[PDB]
């Protein structure tokens, strides 16, 4: 089941900093923010963007593996120095490629190949819009997310829940609203599920595994850290792990105002979406699905990760 | 350890400072200069091995050219002509740009003879050789006297070695200036180490070889470590006043310098390559703390002149020692952080709740606050173990083995080919003993190290903070005493009652933000400081720097504001009566406020009394003095909680003060409301160190040796990019230190601005508006300068971000805007400046331009300064920005100039300056094309390129619109 | 939430300067979008002006519900009592608002939420200067697409089904327009120094005016809708963006001091104004009213949307700044 929400207006997701600070910024939608919308209409698998321009397609955050020239980076290790570096096969230094990757390109991406037409830049999906003088000194400037003409937010939720099909509901920060409809699973997820067996066989035969985080994950057990615990990987069937090479970005620091306790929630650090881990696993993967949940708060749409080969 | 320090001294002084004077007996002078500390034969062999290895791999592997002779280009000029083939006088080449300089004063002091080269028994050599021996003996004697005094001063070998490394060059220079001349000493200090390849001076080689020997002592394997404390921009962003920003930057610099100081203490001051610690004010303060050298306040210490990343090369036997070093750095930094936190906890937090039960309630979160403060920063120490490739075989065999190892790396083709070419060129020399060293690929290691950091700093580990209201300033951490909102408000109200000078009652801070706020009052009573004096500057808010503009009367309102408190007298006497009257008004207002506060009895009497000489300058703004409530809020008091906003009898003196302020404005002018934030960064430092932007080897060798070598070596050197080496890296770091310490604070102070951080390439300043463009071009020229005077300079390009903003805008918003402007300047090419004016009401302009164009814009400002050209000529030209084409641009602008100029000469000058200036403007095309910006930056046949280009009309329209925007921004800045 | 929604039309009688952000030329640029660059009014400002109008009407007691006057003074005591009379003092002290505004247009400064969320005012017809047919209402195909996507959520009956037939593609130098705008003889039309060839079609404008008069009445804001049909043009997306960016009213203003009779130094500035006779549409999303012992008259969502439409139909209200110089007055016609 997919909740397709077209924003009639701009959307706001409050930054952790308070806003007498009139200046205010905006961030990408958070799983805790969108979870409240669906619960106002169970677990949430995650959320992507959707673009309906002639055809309807779903876009996830561009993996940090992909470079500017659409060149994949693989972690290769030198035993002479005994150190592993992420080589792009065209240079030793690289930068992450911002934008979004389609599911139709994602299916091929996990095999180690990507096409130019399978990616979309960030400027073609949504932009940031600044408003000044909103309301002698009461004026505050607020940045919001302005979506494209034929684009919106798709929320991927397991088909075990049901509710009203179509309507209008309020989401985000300030009192805005979007039009939501219930759409069945597109052919992209079906194709991914069909090719999951082949890609899992490739992963098993090659002895290499890649974890791609399509959503932010709070992996911290006692505190909060980007380190990948071996116990979590052992649950899926990994007998042993040799080396772990994680590449991501600045951790997303977020909290919230808990209305139940009338007090703010504890501040939490999460691994940013699009980060990729490379793991040299031993044995085979027993997972029967191409998507798994990691960390805590996985019900709200946190820690959705895909499997890939290299 | 004493023998370790003595051996470090021996390695540093393994070559006499005048080695290039005569290569026949340099080692004898090296043994004599140490005297009782001369090394043994085995120690000399080890030192020579560690010098030939590493240091400058290009140098030694080139000096052994055997083309019918072994070349020699020294000052001796008397050699065995049978197999030496003298070349000429030694020169010095810039390690980056290859700029060539000559020692005119040294040659003038040296004897001059008609014959260029003398044979072994050449006729007439008696007098010249006698004079040469005499001057060499004098130089040796003065060097020995300096070193003997230095050795007599210090007894501990560690302290003696550190002080020698710090100050021997300065002492020798001052002694030679006292004897020969200042110019002679200045040129002598910068003598090259290896005259055949003079890409670095002798002392840079000495530091490099000392670091190499330290990294290869007692069988310890060398390791290249790089330490980074991240993030930085987020930490600096969170601020409310300029004092908070200064405290944040200075705290970050102090932390990284604590790490650097621990590393230097454990191993040596030279083991750190970047930043160059010699000459750093922080290093001098640390030396004073160690009671090694009495600190002199020649260079101001208030500047955060230490970058957040530092690179070192140290010798460790095993990875266990590396882990121990990392744990020691973390222990030292966390101990300093915990000491600061405990000082704040037991000085400020308990300073207001010494009796209240709220302290007992909040004492259960002390461990939590300590943990969240300590783990605020992520510290990454990425270390690469330098591999020891076997070179046991012959020259061809050893070079083949090294190339095979490099191929076994299995790298991308470009860098592998570059390093293969470097190795092949190193193998193009003719010598049986020519063997590649383990540091020949040093640059490669560094490159990998950097990449490691870019991944290793990605990780993080933050503690599980509890639930509660977050901090108001930082907005990311739980505020202190966050269990209850009412309890937190009461606690912070009590704190503001105890500490009303800085903190506001409503401001509920966290650990990190409170530490940042109260850091200035704690640094003067902490380590490194507390014995140096004058660390905290006398500037707290951006209003002061915005008020630092130089008016037409030769007076800056910041000086008169300081005069209000009597800090500095006013030299001008024409306005003395107005100054006295307004001072009396301020004094009586302060007396009334102090009496009212004493009646309230809510703040300590010391703070109220000191408010007379520490009153906020924001009350000087007339618009800010609307009423008593506005005055109380501006001074830093919440009148709503105080209840003093109902005093309606305090309007008479307010009105009188407003009238007096207007009277002062009459012949003075209002305090300007705008100020400029300028941040600059180096252009492709990583690429420059990668060797991609480095010149060919022919540019880093003697001017008269490329033609006197083998053809194969000649062609290899002419078409192979030179790669850095530890000596060259040290020279580059020394040039960066020279730029960042000896030049930028001078121009900032001369520019009447405040420099906050100057570490290496990056620079951050806040300036009065009509002082920013004056110093931006000067600093760009200085950074691009190769040889200024007789001191090295980086000689690279700059990216700059300049933002002209009002003082009421939030600090972090302006910081983020300026950082975004810098990023845009880097995105639209490089060697450029992005200027942006954010006017108060709604206005916002941009212009990404080359530096040389900026001065051109200043020209038209003159035409607007005295109204030689009507300003409307700008507006009308704007209306043509969407229609103008290349063919008729010149004629149309000529028509507009003639129409809007009283004199035809003014119109012609405007036409010429506009035609020149509008050429260089970076454009943001719809298509992802950067070739146009690259053509604009260089300065070329760009007109012909646009003629060949298919989007010429859009490019020229964007160029003219951006130039007009820059002109309007600069003109509004002037007025 | 937000069970129902209503559409509000807005016709600019006088130029409107709402809000203020590049400001490259105009010191106070109009309230403008980011992705498309079209003129727009933020939901915050429209909500504020609507709630101020509602509060003033509640004070004036002219909010007749179901053809019966709504007396709030008795209603607050009827639904709250106890401190309600004291709560009246809060209205008298101006620290609060009348209960109707508190339960519909959001709460006071200090628990609850507004029953209606006010969306953004999206542009629908932009007036541009024409060589023939003095001024023309120009649109863009994506404007029609946005209108259809917005209007799929309210009308759906057959009007929504027939509105799906609007689907056009236009080149950057072609347009479809009425007989008034097209020049005599030559088959081209000039708007704001831009010449466009007329594309032969007779369905898109008819359907547009059909739906406009369908849910806005035959009286098109005091004018016959039939006359409007002859002066409707649809241009390309880039052309519409350029029009909406550069065809607004740039007015230069100064301040003169009586001491010398000349312009004050630094007193000259340019302000940008949205042109008059501009049709804009906004979406108001109304949900279940807050459970606070609401009267049975407006107990359901249908009743509150009905009373809102009745009390705001054919209304006149000022938006944006410069109210003191006759700027911002617009006429609102609720979609029935
Ligand atoms: N104390 C300081 N004051 C001011 N600027 C500083 C200070 N220390 C470092 N900087 C500069 O601020 C910037 C922050 O460095 P940082 O390590 O965050 O790099 P970055 O490019 O922003 O990203 P990343 O965090 O991934 O390295 C750099 O340009 C650095 O030179
Ligand atoms: N002499 C030096 N030795 C070692 N590291 C240095 C030296 N000078 C600068 N650095 C470091 O190199 C890094 C350069 O990063 P930066 O973001 O400036 O990129 P860059 O390659 O210089 O180019 P650009 O900023 O134009 O993209 C910084 O972390 C800086 O501290
Ligand atoms: Mg750089
Ligand atoms: Zn904080």
CSV table of C-alpha atoms in Angstrom, one decimal, chain A:
chain,number,residue,atom,x,y,z
A,1,UNK,CA,0.0,0.0,0.0
A,2,UNK,CA,1.3,3.5,-0.9
A,3,UNK,CA,-0.1,6.7,0.5
A,4,UNK,CA,0.5,9.2,-2.3
A,5,UNK,CA,0.3,12.8,-1.0
A,6,UNK,CA,0.3,15.7,-3.4
A,7,UNK,CA,1.1,19.0,-1.6
A,8,UNK,CA,-1.3,21.7,-2.5
A,9,UNK,CA,1.2,24.2,-0.9
A,10,UNK,CA,4.7,24.3,0.5
A,11,UNK,CA,5.6,22.1,3.5
A,12,UNK,CA,7.6,22.8,6.6
A,13,UNK,CA,9.6,20.5,8.9
A,14,UNK,CA,11.0,22.4,11.9
A,15,UNK,CA,14.7,22.5,12.5
A,16,UNK,CA,15.9,21.5,16.0
A,17,UNK,CA,16.8,25.1,16.8
A,18,UNK,CA,13.9,27.0,18.3
A,19,UNK,CA,12.1,29.6,16.2
A,20,UNK,CA,12.8,34.8,19.9
A,21,UNK,CA,14.9,33.6,17.0
A,22,UNK,CA,12.9,34.8,14.0
A,23,UNK,CA,15.1,33.0,11.5
A,24,UNK,CA,14.0,29.5,10.7
A,25,UNK,CA,15.4,26.8,8.3
A,26,UNK,CA,13.9,23.7,6.8
A,27,UNK,CA,15.0,20.0,6.5
A,28,UNK,CA,13.8,17.0,4.6
A,29,UNK,CA,10.7,15.2,5.9
A,30,UNK,CA,11.4,13.0,8.9
A,31,UNK,CA,9.8,9.6,9.6
A,32,UNK,CA,8.4,10.7,12.9
A,33,UNK,CA,6.7,13.7,11.3
A,34,UNK,CA,5.0,11.6,8.5
A,35,UNK,CA,4.1,8.9,11.0
A,36,UNK,CA,1.8,11.3,12.8
A,37,UNK,CA,0.0,12.0,9.5
A,38,UNK,CA,-0.7,8.4,8.7
A,39,UNK,CA,-1.7,7.6,12.3
A,40,UNK,CA,-4.2,10.5,12.1
A,41,UNK,CA,-5.8,8.9,9.1
A,42,UNK,CA,0.8,-0.6,12.4
A,43,UNK,CA,4.3,0.1,10.9
A,44,UNK,CA,5.6,2.4,8.2
A,45,UNK,CA,8.1,0.8,5.8
A,46,UNK,CA,9.3,4.3,4.8
A,47,UNK,CA,8.7,7.2,2.4
A,48,UNK,CA,10.1,8.3,-0.9
A,49,UNK,CA,9.3,11.0,-3.4
A,50,UNK,CA,7.1,10.5,-6.5
A,51,UNK,CA,7.1,12.1,-9.9
A,52,UNK,CA,4.1,11.7,-12.2
A,53,UNK,CA,5.2,13.2,-15.6
A,54,UNK,CA,3.4,11.1,-18.2
A,55,UNK,CA,4.6,8.0,-16.2
A,56,UNK,CA,4.5,7.6,-12.5
A,57,UNK,CA,7.9,6.9,-10.8
A,58,UNK,CA,9.3,6.7,-7.3
A,59,UNK,CA,12.5,8.3,-6.2
A,60,UNK,CA,14.7,7.5,-3.2
A,61,UNK,CA,17.6,9.5,-1.9
A,62,UNK,CA,20.6,9.3,-4.1
A,63,UNK,CA,23.1,6.8,-2.6
A,64,UNK,CA,26.4,8.2,-1.4
A,65,UNK,CA,28.0,5.4,-3.4
A,66,UNK,CA,27.1,7.2,-6.7
A,67,UNK,CA,29.5,10.0,-7.6
A,68,UNK,CA,29.1,13.1,-9.8
A,69,UNK,CA,29.9,11.1,-13.0
A,70,UNK,CA,27.6,8.3,-12.0
A,71,UNK,CA,30.7,6.2,-11.1
A,72,UNK,CA,30.2,3.7,-8.3
A,73,UNK,CA,32.8,3.6,-5.5
A,74,UNK,CA,33.9,0.2,-4.2
A,75,UNK,CA,36.0,-0.4,-1.1
A,76,UNK,CA,39.2,-2.1,-2.1
A,77,UNK,CA,41.9,-2.9,0.5
A,78,UNK,CA,45.7,-3.0,0.2
A,79,UNK,CA,47.4,-5.6,2.2
A,80,UNK,CA,50.8,-3.9,1.7
A,81,UNK,CA,49.5,-1.0,3.8
A,82,UNK,CA,46.6,-3.1,5.2
A,83,UNK,CA,44.0,-0.3,4.7
A,84,UNK,CA,40.8,-0.1,2.7
A,85,UNK,CA,39.8,2.9,0.6
A,86,UNK,CA,36.8,3.6,-1.5
A,87,UNK,CA,38.0,3.8,-5.1
A,88,UNK,CA,35.8,5.1,-7.9
A,89,UNK,CA,37.8,3.4,-10.7
A,90,UNK,CA,38.4,6.9,-12.0
A,91,UNK,CA,40.0,8.7,-9.0
A,92,UNK,CA,40.9,8.3,-5.4
A,93,UNK,CA,38.8,11.3,-4.2
A,94,UNK,CA,35.1,11.9,-4.9
A,95,UNK,CA,32.0,13.7,-3.7
A,96,UNK,CA,28.5,12.3,-3.1
A,97,UNK,CA,26.0,12.9,-5.9
A,98,UNK,CA,23.0,14.8,-4.7
A,99,UNK,CA,19.5,14.1,-6.2
A,100,UNK,CA,17.3,11.1,-6.3
A,101,UNK,CA,17.4,7.6,-7.8
A,102,UNK,CA,14.4,5.9,-9.3
A,103,UNK,CA,13.3,2.4,-8.3
A,104,UNK,CA,13.6,1.4,-12.0
A,105,UNK,CA,17.2,2.5,-11.6
A,106,UNK,CA,17.5,1.1,-8.1
A,107,UNK,CA,16.9,-2.4,-9.3
A,108,UNK,CA,20.0,-2.2,-11.5
A,109,UNK,CA,22.0,-0.1,-9.0
A,110,UNK,CA,22.2,-3.1,-6.5
A,111,UNK,CA,23.9,-5.0,-9.3
A,112,UNK,CA,26.7,-2.3,-9.6
A,113,UNK,CA,25.4,-0.5,-12.7
A,114,UNK,CA,23.4,2.7,-13.1
A,115,UNK,CA,22.2,4.6,-16.2
A,116,UNK,CA,22.1,8.4,-16.7
A,117,UNK,CA,18.4,8.4,-17.3
A,118,UNK,CA,17.8,6.5,-14.0
A,119,UNK,CA,18.7,9.5,-11.8
A,120,UNK,CA,17.1,12.9,-11.2
A,121,UNK,CA,18.8,16.1,-9.8
A,122,UNK,CA,17.5,17.7,-6.7
A,123,UNK,CA,16.5,20.9,-8.4
A,124,UNK,CA,14.1,19.0,-10.7
A,125,UNK,CA,12.2,17.4,-7.7
A,126,UNK,CA,11.7,20.2,-5.2
A,127,UNK,CA,13.3,23.5,-4.1
A,128,UNK,CA,13.7,25.7,-1.0
A,129,UNK,CA,11.5,28.8,-0.7
A,130,UNK,CA,12.2,31.6,1.8
A,131,UNK,CA,9.5,33.9,3.2
A,132,UNK,CA,10.3,37.2,4.9
A,133,UNK,CA,8.2,39.6,6.9
A,134,UNK,CA,5.6,37.0,7.7
A,135,UNK,CA,4.2,38.7,10.8
A,136,UNK,CA,7.5,46.1,14.4
A,137,UNK,CA,9.7,43.1,15.4
A,138,UNK,CA,7.2,40.2,15.0
A,139,UNK,CA,8.5,39.5,11.5
A,140,UNK,CA,10.1,36.0,11.1
A,141,UNK,CA,11.6,34.5,8.0
A,142,UNK,CA,10.8,30.9,7.3
A,143,UNK,CA,12.2,28.4,4.8
A,144,UNK,CA,9.9,25.8,3.3
A,145,UNK,CA,9.9,23.0,0.8
A,146,UNK,CA,8.2,23.8,-2.5
A,147,UNK,CA,7.5,20.7,-4.6
A,148,UNK,CA,7.5,20.4,-8.3
A,149,UNK,CA,4.3,20.7,-10.3
A,150,UNK,CA,3.9,17.0,-10.9
A,151,UNK,CA,5.6,15.6,-7.7
A,152,UNK,CA,4.8,14.7,-4.1
A,153,UNK,CA,5.5,12.4,-1.2
A,154,UNK,CA,4.8,8.7,-1.4
A,155,UNK,CA,4.6,6.9,2.0
A,156,UNK,CA,5.4,3.1,1.7
A,157,UNK,CA,3.4,1.2,4.3
A,158,UNK,CA,2.9,-2.5,4.7
A,159,UNK,CA,-0.4,-3.7,3.2
A,160,UNK,CA,-1.6,-5.0,6.7
A,161,UNK,CA,-3.4,-1.8,7.5
A,162,UNK,CA,-6.4,0.0,5.8
A,163,UNK,CA,-8.1,3.3,6.2
A,164,UNK,CA,-9.9,6.0,4.1
A,165,UNK,CA,-8.8,5.9,0.5
A,166,UNK,CA,-8.8,9.5,-0.7
A,167,UNK,CA,-9.1,12.8,1.0
A,168,UNK,CA,-7.2,15.9,2.4
A,169,UNK,CA,-5.1,15.8,5.5
A,170,UNK,CA,-2.8,18.3,7.3
A,171,UNK,CA,1.0,17.5,7.6
A,172,UNK,CA,4.2,19.3,8.2
A,173,UNK,CA,4.9,22.3,10.4
A,174,UNK,CA,2.6,25.3,10.1
A,175,UNK,CA,-1.0,24.5,9.3
A,176,UNK,CA,-0.8,23.2,5.8
A,177,UNK,CA,-2.6,20.4,4.0
A,178,UNK,CA,-2.0,17.9,1.2
A,179,UNK,CA,-4.3,15.6,-0.8
A,180,UNK,CA,-3.7,12.0,-0.1
A,181,UNK,CA,-4.8,8.9,-2.1
A,182,UNK,CA,-4.3,5.2,-1.6
A,183,UNK,CA,-2.5,3.6,-4.5
A,184,UNK,CA,-1.6,-0.1,-5.0
A,185,UNK,CA,2.0,-1.3,-5.2
A,186,UNK,CA,3.5,-0.2,-8.6
A,187,UNK,CA,5.4,-2.5,-11.0
A,188,UNK,CA,8.7,-1.2,-9.5
A,189,UNK,CA,8.3,-2.9,-6.2
A,190,UNK,CA,7.1,-6.1,-8.0
A,191,UNK,CA,10.1,-6.1,-10.2
A,192,UNK,CA,12.4,-5.5,-7.2
A,193,UNK,CA,10.8,-8.5,-5.4
A,194,UNK,CA,11.1,-10.7,-8.5
A,195,UNK,CA,14.8,-9.8,-8.9
A,196,UNK,CA,15.5,-10.1,-5.2
A,197,UNK,CA,16.1,-13.8,-5.6
A,198,UNK,CA,18.7,-13.3,-8.3
A,199,UNK,CA,20.4,-10.5,-6.5
A,200,UNK,CA,20.5,-12.5,-3.3
A,201,UNK,CA,22.1,-15.4,-5.2
A,202,UNK,CA,24.7,-13.0,-6.6
A,203,UNK,CA,25.4,-11.7,-3.1
A,204,UNK,CA,25.7,-15.2,-1.7
A,205,UNK,CA,28.0,-16.4,-4.5
A,206,UNK,CA,30.2,-13.3,-4.4
A,207,UNK,CA,30.6,-13.1,-0.6
A,208,UNK,CA,30.1,-9.4,-0.6
A,209,UNK,CA,27.2,-7.4,0.9
A,210,UNK,CA,26.1,-3.7,0.7
A,211,UNK,CA,23.6,-2.1,3.0
A,212,UNK,CA,21.9,1.0,1.5
A,213,UNK,CA,20.0,3.2,4.0
A,214,UNK,CA,17.0,4.7,2.2
A,215,UNK,CA,15.8,6.3,5.5
A,216,UNK,CA,17.6,7.7,8.5
A,217,UNK,CA,18.4,5.1,11.2
A,218,UNK,CA,19.1,5.5,14.9
A,219,UNK,CA,21.6,2.6,15.3
A,220,UNK,CA,22.8,3.6,18.8
A,221,UNK,CA,22.4,0.8,21.4
A,222,UNK,CA,23.4,2.7,24.6
A,223,UNK,CA,24.3,6.1,23.1
A,224,UNK,CA,24.1,6.9,19.4
A,225,UNK,CA,26.8,6.0,16.9
A,226,UNK,CA,27.2,5.1,13.2
A,227,UNK,CA,29.1,1.9,14.1
A,228,UNK,CA,27.3,-1.2,12.7
A,229,UNK,CA,26.9,-3.9,15.4
A,230,UNK,CA,27.8,-7.4,14.3
A,231,UNK,CA,24.8,-8.9,16.2
A,232,UNK,CA,22.3,-7.1,13.9
A,233,UNK,CA,24.0,-8.5,10.8
A,234,UNK,CA,24.2,-11.9,12.4
A,235,UNK,CA,20.4,-12.1,12.7
A,236,UNK,CA,19.8,-12.1,9.0
A,237,UNK,CA,22.0,-15.2,8.6
A,238,UNK,CA,25.6,-13.8,8.4
A,239,UNK,CA,27.8,-16.4,10.1
A,240,UNK,CA,30.8,-13.9,10.3
A,241,UNK,CA,31.9,-10.5,9.1
A,242,UNK,CA,35.5,-9.6,8.0
A,243,UNK,CA,35.5,-5.8,7.5
A,244,UNK,CA,33.0,-3.0,7.6
A,245,UNK,CA,33.4,0.2,5.5
A,246,UNK,CA,30.6,2.8,6.1
A,247,UNK,CA,30.3,6.0,4.2
A,248,UNK,CA,27.6,8.6,5.0
A,249,UNK,CA,27.2,12.2,5.9
A,250,UNK,CA,26.7,14.5,8.9
A,251,UNK,CA,24.4,12.8,11.5
A,252,UNK,CA,20.8,14.1,11.6
A,253,UNK,CA,20.1,15.5,15.1
A,254,UNK,CA,16.4,15.7,15.8
A,255,UNK,CA,13.8,15.7,18.7
A,256,UNK,CA,10.2,16.5,19.1
A,257,UNK,CA,7.6,17.9,21.5
A,258,UNK,CA,5.8,14.9,23.1
A,259,UNK,CA,2.2,16.1,23.7
A,260,UNK,CA,1.5,13.1,25.9
A,261,UNK,CA,4.1,14.2,28.5
A,262,UNK,CA,3.9,17.9,27.6
A,263,UNK,CA,7.7,17.8,27.4
A,264,UNK,CA,10.2,17.6,24.5
A,265,UNK,CA,11.5,14.2,23.5
A,266,UNK,CA,15.1,13.3,24.1
A,267,UNK,CA,17.5,14.6,21.4
A,268,UNK,CA,18.5,11.7,19.1
A,269,UNK,CA,21.3,11.3,16.5
A,270,UNK,CA,20.6,9.2,13.4
A,271,UNK,CA,22.7,8.1,10.4
A,272,UNK,CA,21.7,10.3,7.4
A,273,UNK,CA,19.7,8.6,4.6
A,274,UNK,CA,21.7,7.5,1.6
A,275,UNK,CA,24.6,6.2,3.6
A,276,UNK,CA,26.0,2.9,2.5
A,277,UNK,CA,27.8,0.2,4.4
A,278,UNK,CA,30.1,-2.4,2.7
A,279,UNK,CA,30.4,-5.7,4.6
A,280,UNK,CA,32.4,-8.8,3.7
A,281,UNK,CA,30.0,-11.4,5.1
A,282,UNK,CA,30.5,-15.1,5.7
A,283,UNK,CA,28.0,-17.7,4.7
A,284,UNK,CA,24.7,-16.5,3.1
A,285,UNK,CA,21.8,-14.1,3.7
A,286,UNK,CA,18.6,-15.8,4.9
A,287,UNK,CA,16.5,-12.7,4.4
A,288,UNK,CA,13.6,-13.3,2.0
A,289,UNK,CA,12.9,-9.6,1.4
A,290,UNK,CA,15.1,-6.9,-0.3
A,291,UNK,CA,14.4,-4.5,2.6
A,292,UNK,CA,15.1,-4.7,6.3
A,293,UNK,CA,14.6,-2.5,9.4
A,294,UNK,CA,17.6,-1.4,11.5
A,295,UNK,CA,18.0,0.4,14.7
A,296,UNK,CA,15.1,1.7,16.8
A,297,UNK,CA,11.8,3.3,15.9
A,298,UNK,CA,11.6,1.2,12.8
A,299,UNK,CA,7.8,1.3,13.0
A,300,UNK,CA,7.7,5.0,12.3
A,301,UNK,CA,9.8,4.6,9.1
A,302,UNK,CA,13.3,4.5,10.4
A,303,UNK,CA,16.2,2.3,9.2
A,304,UNK,CA,14.8,1.0,5.9
A,305,UNK,CA,17.8,-0.6,4.2
A,306,UNK,CA,18.2,-2.4,0.9
A,307,UNK,CA,20.7,-5.1,-0.1
A,308,UNK,CA,23.2,-4.8,-2.9
A,309,UNK,CA,26.0,-6.7,-4.5
A,310,UNK,CA,29.5,-5.7,-5.6
